[PDB]
Amino acid sequence: KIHHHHHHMDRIIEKLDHGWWVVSHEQKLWLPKGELPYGEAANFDLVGQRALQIGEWQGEPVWLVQQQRRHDMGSVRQVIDLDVGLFQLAGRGVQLAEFYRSHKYCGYCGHEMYPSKTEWAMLCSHCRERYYPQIAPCIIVAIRRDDSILLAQHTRHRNGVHTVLAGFVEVGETLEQAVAREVMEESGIKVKNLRYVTSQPWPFPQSLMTAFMAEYDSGDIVIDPKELLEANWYRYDDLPLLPPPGTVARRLIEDTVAMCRAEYE
Amino acid sequence: HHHHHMDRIIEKLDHGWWVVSHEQKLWLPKGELPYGEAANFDLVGQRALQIGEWQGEPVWLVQQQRRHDMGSVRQVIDLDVGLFQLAGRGVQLAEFYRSHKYCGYCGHEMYPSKTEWAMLCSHCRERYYPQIAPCIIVAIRRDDSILLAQHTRHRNGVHTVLAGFVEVGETLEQAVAREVMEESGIKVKNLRYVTSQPWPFPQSLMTAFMAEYDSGDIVIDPKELLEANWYRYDDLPLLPPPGTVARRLIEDTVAMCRAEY
Ligand SMILES: [Zn+2]
Ligand SMILES: [Zn+2]
Structure with a gap:
C-alpha cells in the first residue's frame, strides 16, 4: 500500500489567526473587490468559523472556509493574475470544498461521512470505506x-x-x-x-x-x-x-x- | 468526457474476453483470464459492458461474484501489457460503480450513464466519473x-x-x-x-x-x-x-x- 499525505485537521478560527482565506462553496470563492481575502480573521467576519489549513504562501497560512457569502462569489479564474503558487492554493481550496460536499454520504453504503483527522480524506460512520480528493x-x-x-x-x-x-x-x-x-x-x-x-x-x-x-x-x-x-x-x-x-x-x-x-531559420 | 458503448445483456453467441469482477478481484479459472463463448462460462443473460478490444475480440466487464478462483489482477500481470491494462480497467470500473451506489451529495441511489462511464443521481443533478x-x-x-x-x-x-x-x-x-x-x-x-x-x-x-x-x-x-x-x-x-x-x-x-x- 501507498499512503496519502498527512495533514492538519480543521479547527475553529480565532482572532489571532491570519492569512489568505479561500471562502468557497459550489465551485466558487469569495473575492471582495475582485480580490482574494487577506488579513486577520475578524476583518472578514470569520472568527468562530471552522477553517482548514491548505497551505502557506510566503510565510502566511492559506485557509479554507466552507461558506457562501451574499456577494462577490466568483470563479477562481478571476484571480489567475496572482503568483502561480498562490493561484494553485486557491484552486486547492475550491477543489477541497467540492470534495467534502461530494462526500456528505458514503457512495458504498449511503451513510453519513466525516472528515479524517490526519489526512484529506472522508471516512464513513457505518462501513470501512473512504475517499480522497x-x-x-x-x-x-x-x-x-x-x-x-x-x-x-x-x-x-x-x-x-x-x-x-x-x-x-x-x-x-x-x-x-x-x-x-x-x-x-x-x-x-x-x-x-x-x-x-x-x-x-x-x-x-x-x-x-x-x-x-x-x-x-x-x-x-x-x-x-x-x-x-x-x-x-x-x-x-x-x-x-x-x-x-x-x-x-x-x-x-x-x-x-x-x-x-x-x-x- | 468521452462517450462509450452502453451495457447490455449477454447472448449465447457472445464472445471475447471476460473480466468478471466483484470487490477488487476478478475470475481467473485455473489462473487464466476467461476467453471464449459466453455459454462456456454460463454467462448468458448477465449484463455486460464492453470495456475494449484485444486483438479483434471484445473485452467485457461482468459484475458478478463466482464461488472459486476470484483473485487479484496482479495474477494476470504476465499477460501482454495491453491485455493487462484492459483487465485492470474492468476491475477499476467495477469498483467505481460499487463505490457510487449512493450519491455522496444527497444520499439517493445512483444509476449508470449509457453515454459514458459515469454514475448519475436519481434525485440531484450531480455526477461522478471514475x-x-x-x-x-x-x-x-x-x-x-x-x-x-x-x-x-x-x-x-x-x-x-x-x-x-x-x-x-x-x-x-x-x-x-x-x-x-x-x-x-x-x-x-x-x-x-x-x-x-x-x-x-x-x-x-x-x-x-x-x-x-x-x-x-x-x-x-x-x-x-x-x-x-x-x-x-x-x-x-x-x-x-x-x-x-x-x-x-x-x-x-x-x-x-x-x-x-
Ligand atoms: Zn459507508
Ligand atoms: Zn444526489
Whole structure:
C-alpha cells in the first residue's frame, strides 16, 4: 500500500489567526473587490468559523472556509493574475470544498461521512470505506508539422482563441495512449515523437494537465463538430489569437514555434 | 468526457474476453483470464459492458461474484501489457460503480450513464466519473549509483524506488521534489519524465521520472521506509519484478551508469 499525505485537521478560527482565506462553496470563492481575502480573521467576519489549513504562501497560512457569502462569489479564474503558487492554493481550496460536499454520504453504503483527522480524506460512520480528493489527469498536446502547428477553436466558446488539443485520460490507459486517442477522435490525425514538457493543475473543476509535444505522422484533418468549430495548420511565423501568457497551452505553442525557428531559420 | 458503448445483456453467441469482477478481484479459472463463448462460462443473460478490444475480440466487464478462483489482477500481470491494462480497467470500473451506489451529495441511489462511464443521481443533478490517482515514481541517480529503499509496508526484501501520490493543486514536478525530500531528505535535479502506466492497486496512474542528486544526506521517514541507501549499478540488491515500471526505471538508470563507468 501507498499512503496519502498527512495533514492538519480543521479547527475553529480565532482572532489571532491570519492569512489568505479561500471562502468557497459550489465551485466558487469569495473575492471582495475582485480580490482574494487577506488579513486577520475578524476583518472578514470569520472568527468562530471552522477553517482548514491548505497551505502557506510566503510565510502566511492559506485557509479554507466552507461558506457562501451574499456577494462577490466568483470563479477562481478571476484571480489567475496572482503568483502561480498562490493561484494553485486557491484552486486547492475550491477543489477541497467540492470534495467534502461530494462526500456528505458514503457512495458504498449511503451513510453519513466525516472528515479524517490526519489526512484529506472522508471516512464513513457505518462501513470501512473512504475517499480522497479526485484529480482528473488530462493530456494537452501541441502538434507540429514541419513549419506549422495545429490550432483549433472549440465550438463551445466563440472567443476567437485558437489553442491546442486537450482531453481527459480514461481508466486503464497511459498518458501516451490518451494523447494518441484524443488527437484521433478530435482531428483524425495520427501523431508521433511524443515528448512530455510539463504539468499544471487546472481547477476547472479538478484537472491535472500533462503537456506534450508531438509530430504529425499521417491523416486528414477531420474535426468532430461537437468538440471543434475548426482546426488548421498555421505557420510558426503567422499565428492567430492564442491562449494567454501563463497557460500551459501558450507555453507549448511557444516551444513549438521556437524549434521551427531553430530548424527553418 | 468521452462517450462509450452502453451495457447490455449477454447472448449465447457472445464472445471475447471476460473480466468478471466483484470487490477488487476478478475470475481467473485455473489462473487464466476467461476467453471464449459466453455459454462456456454460463454467462448468458448477465449484463455486460464492453470495456475494449484485444486483438479483434471484445473485452467485457461482468459484475458478478463466482464461488472459486476470484483473485487479484496482479495474477494476470504476465499477460501482454495491453491485455493487462484492459483487465485492470474492468476491475477499476467495477469498483467505481460499487463505490457510487449512493450519491455522496444527497444520499439517493445512483444509476449508470449509457453515454459514458459515469454514475448519475436519481434525485440531484450531480455526477461522478471514475477516480484515477496520479502517483509519481522516481529513480534517483548519483554518479555511479542509484537510490533504492526498502518499504515498511511489507517485509519484501525488495529494494525499489520512491513513489507517492500527487496532491491536489500540485504539479508532477513539485510532487517528485516533495516526496523525495519527505521520504529521504535529499534535493534532486534535472527531473526527466520517462513514461506512465495505469496501476490498478486500486486506481493509480504511475508517472515515471528520473532525477539526479543535488544535495542532502539520506534521512529516512521511518513510517514509510525501513532503510534507504545508494547502490552501485554493478552491485544491485533485490529489485522489483520485470513487469513493473519500478524495474524499468532502475534498468534505465543502471543502463546509463554502465555507459559512463
Ligand atoms: Zn459507508
Ligand atoms: Zn444526489
